[PDB]
Amino acid sequence: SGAIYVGNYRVVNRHLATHNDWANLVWEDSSRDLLVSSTTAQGCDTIARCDCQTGVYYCSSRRKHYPVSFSKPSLIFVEASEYYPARYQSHLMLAVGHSEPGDCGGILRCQHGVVGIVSTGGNGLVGFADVRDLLWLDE
Ligand SMILES: NC(=O)[C@H]1CCCN(C(=O)Cc2cccc3ncsc23)C1
Ligand SMILES: [Zn+2]
């Protein structure tokens, strides 16, 4: 679990969104596994606006932060689950590292701010849904 709170927005994994998230929906994209809902309180998370390929992510399954090199956001095949059929997930970035299903929502950050959230994993690789292109999250 985990979310990004920026201004009057809450960013979560679309497959983990609540009834409250859907009742206050702003935007969702199943191809990216993202959902953004409105909030009443302000959020102060800084979103990174960069092309960094190194950062640190939180891994709840180890209660630890790990440093990683990660690929540029791209279309990557993701196997079926109780949430989605087999498909290509866009805006996805991979890194060599540990993750487990309950690790989704863990934040990836560089020196500039929040880069994305854990969304996929398996085979010693962790996938992060990028959020750096969502310029509207600030304005
Ligand atoms: N975005 C999706 O389509 C995901 C929906 C939930 C299931 N997905 C996984 O990758 C499961 C998983 C297994 C093993 C490590 C792992 N680490 C994070 S999730 C994860 C795919
Ligand atoms: Zn950066």
Swiss-Prot record:
Homodimer. Cysteine protease that cleaves viral polyprotein and specific host proteins. It is responsible for the autocatalytic cleavage between the P1 and P2 regions, which is the first cleavage occurring in the polyprotein. Also cleaves the host translation initiation factor EIF4G1, in order to shut down the capped cellular mRNA translation. Inhibits the host nucleus-cytoplasm protein and RNA trafficking by cleaving host members of the nuclear pores. Counteracts stress granule formation probably by antagonizing its assembly or promoting its dissassembly. It comes from Coxsackievirus A16 (strain G-10). Zn(2+) 1 binds at residues 50, 52, 110, 112. It catalyses: Selective cleavage of Tyr-|-Gly bond in the picornavirus polyprotein. This is Protease 2A. The chain holds residues 869 to 1007 of 2193 of the full protein. The active site is at 15 (for protease 2a activity), 33 (for protease 2a activity), 104 (for protease 2a activity).
